[PDB]
Structure formats: C-alpha cells, structure tokens
Design an enzyme around this catalytic site. Sequence first.
Site, short mmCIF file in Angstrom:
data_model
loop_
_atom_site.label_atom_id
_atom_site.label_comp_id
_atom_site.label_asym_id
_atom_site.label_seq_id
_atom_site.Cartn_x
_atom_site.Cartn_y
_atom_site.Cartn_z
CG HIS A 133 -1.97 -1.04 1.06
ND1 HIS A 133 -2.79 -1.35 0.04
CD2 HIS A 133 -2.43 -1.92 1.91
CE1 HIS A 133 -3.66 -2.27 0.22
NE2 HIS A 133 -3.32 -2.75 1.47
CG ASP A 171 -2.45 -8.44 0.87
OD1 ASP A 171 -3.46 -8.03 0.79
OD2 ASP A 171 -1.65 -8.52 1.93
CG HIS A 173 -6.61 -5.51 1.35
ND1 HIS A 173 -5.78 -6.32 2.36
CD2 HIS A 173 -7.69 -5.24 1.69
CE1 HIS A 173 -6.86 -6.50 3.31
NE2 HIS A 173 -8.05 -5.79 2.92
CG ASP A 264 -4.66 -9.89 3.50
OD1 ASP A 264 -4.07 -10.63 2.39
OD2 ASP A 264 -4.46 -8.65 3.57
CE1 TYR A 304 -2.55 -7.58 8.94
CE2 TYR A 304 -3.92 -7.95 7.20
CZ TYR A 304 -3.05 -7.26 7.79
OH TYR A 304 -2.42 -6.37 6.70
#
Length: 357
Positions: A133, A171, A173, A264, A304
Amino acid sequence: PITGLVYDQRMMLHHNMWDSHHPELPQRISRIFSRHEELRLLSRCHRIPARLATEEELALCHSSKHISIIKSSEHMKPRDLNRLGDEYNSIFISNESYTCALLAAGSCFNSAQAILTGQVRNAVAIVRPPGHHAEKDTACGFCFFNTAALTARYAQSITRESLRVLIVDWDVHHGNGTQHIFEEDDSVLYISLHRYEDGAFFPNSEDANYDKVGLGKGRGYNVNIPWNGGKMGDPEYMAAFHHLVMPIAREFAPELVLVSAGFDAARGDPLGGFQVTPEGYAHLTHQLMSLAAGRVLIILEGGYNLTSISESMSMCTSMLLGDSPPSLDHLTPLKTSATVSINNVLRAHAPFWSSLR
Ligand SMILES: O=C(NO)c1ccc(Cn2nnnc2-c2cccs2)cc1
Ligand SMILES: [K+]
Ligand SMILES: [K+]
Ligand SMILES: [Zn+2]
C-alpha cells in the site's frame, strides 16, 4: 531446490501503542517463523541475514520528503506519533517503526541478491511491517515503504535495469502503491488478485479495477484481477492462475518473480473474508516456480489470522524446497462473478497478450 529464508525478531518492535489488539501484530512474523521450526522447514533452508535498507535504496521508489518524515518518527513523543499516523490512511507509528520498515526492505534486498548471484534459487522473507500500500510519497494501510517495489528496483540495480520482474500480489487487497510505482514501466509486470467489490474493499479505489492496464510504455504490464460478490477460495484462484496469471507470465518471460504474499485471502482471516487453503497457496507457489527458472522470492504482506498465515506461508516454503504439492482434489465450480471477473480481465488484456486470445 536450494531455498533462502530471512527472519529477524527486531521487526517485532513496530507496535500500535494505543491499541495492542490491532491485527498487524508483532507475533505475525514470530508465529510464521516458529511454525517453520515446528515443521522443521528451517533446517532445510539457507538462513539469509537481515539488514537495514539505506536511505539511498529507499530513494529507488520513495521521495526525500516521505523518507525524511518517516525517519523523523524515531524521536517523537507518543502524542506526535499519534498525530503523524493520523496524517495517513490506516497507519500507526512507534519509535521503532522506521527501523522495522528498513529491516523489511534490507531483508528482501539480501534475499534478491542471494537469488540473482546464484547462492539460492528461491527464498521466503518473513518481514513486517508490510509494503504494498506504500506510495512514492506516502504511508498507507499499515505500510511505510513498498518492500516489493524496492526489491524489484534493487534487483534491477545489482543486475541490469532491463531485468524483467513479475510481481504477483496475492494479498487479498490491491497493491495501490506497487501498481502506481510501475504503471508506466514495461520492465515490471504487476499482477494483483484482490477483493474489489466495486470499490467497497480497502483501499477503495477504481485504480484496482480490471480496466487499469498501465500507462504509455507500461500499457498491458499492469493486470488487476478484481473479485466482486464476496467469498472466494481455491477454485477462483486456480481458475485465475490458469486463464490469466500463468499465460501472461509465460509471454512476459520474467527473469525474477516477487510474490507480494499477503495471507489475508486465507480461510480464517478476519479482514479478507475469503477461503484460500494452505494447499491452494501450495499450488499457486508451485505454478510460479515454473517461471524464471524457479527464481521466486516470497515476501510477507498482510494476513491477520496467526494460524492461517503460519500454515499458509509454511506450505509455500515447503513448495520452494521442491516438496510435492498436496492434491487439490474435487475443487467446486467457480462462483459466477469470478467467471465474469476473469472474462473482464481477458477483454482488457487480450489487446496486449496473444496467449489470452
Ligand atoms: O494491509 C491491510 N491488509 O493486509 C489493510 C490495511 C488497511 C485496512 C483498513 N481497514 N479497512 N477495514 N478495516 C480496517 C482496519 C483498520 C485497522 C484495523 S482493521 C485493512 C487492511
Ligand atoms: K493483491
Ligand atoms: K507495470
Ligand atoms: Zn492485505
């Protein structure tokens, strides 16, 4: 193969001093590493030493302004740390955060170097905070510096500026930072699979949609595979790899594969809501090993659930060591919106990639 591993406990120092239940926990890397010892994968790996990236190496992708502001956090009172982090989208900062981000990047630079000089064929980097990010100019989404993008530029810098790097971002995201840093670059192929939900899923930008293909010389070298309609798992990821990731990666003929390996999308993850299994991850690793004569560096991003990430990253290392992939028997039929997602990416990228047509 001969497989590198880098882990440093110092990367655990980065912490949320206002909220110690924040999912991006120090014990993410300590648990992944412990599970590698427990499965006795560690004794089969070449231990690569961690190291701090230099400010010069950070400048491969980040501005002076940004490097300078994150460096100034080392010496701030809590109330200044709190207010600095509130300047970003989803950032907490401690006095150790800069050092840890340095350690994440340096660990990955040493790993890229071990691979490209022939000391190992492939490697896993158990690092935090995550990177994908992070933008040229800003921290975002628990990320300070774009570890993956920096490693792609550091690899080009110790070899040749032409080195064809594929970054596969699995990932859950979108790597907003990774896409932007290489959007105009035909030497770095960025493939992201990510939960999108029409902009509803973090980082909430239309930039993650399938029709963002790259700019100018980079047109076609940015491949977003966005998922809509909730829960996805092994079948969708196996379908995306077969019809898109592997055909495009083969045409591109990368000389190095970085995996922005967030776990994730794993079953049990509180932030992903997806159901990728460790066996699923083992199959995606094994498939990527077919590229770049097996030159694959796996870099921890998010993930997570401490069990899911420890089991998922261990299965990846196991594949890099050349173990046989678990049967992925009796995969269910694809979710429809996932067929539509794959077909939207085909329509967007067929103009650029003959292997899709
Ligand atoms: O890096 C990430 N995943 O790998 C990431 C980054 C930012 C966000 C932001 N967000 N959105 N919704 N809840 C949240 C939370 C913020 C703090 C705790 S939860 C989620 C995930
Ligand atoms: K992704
Ligand atoms: K690109
Ligand atoms: Zn993530």
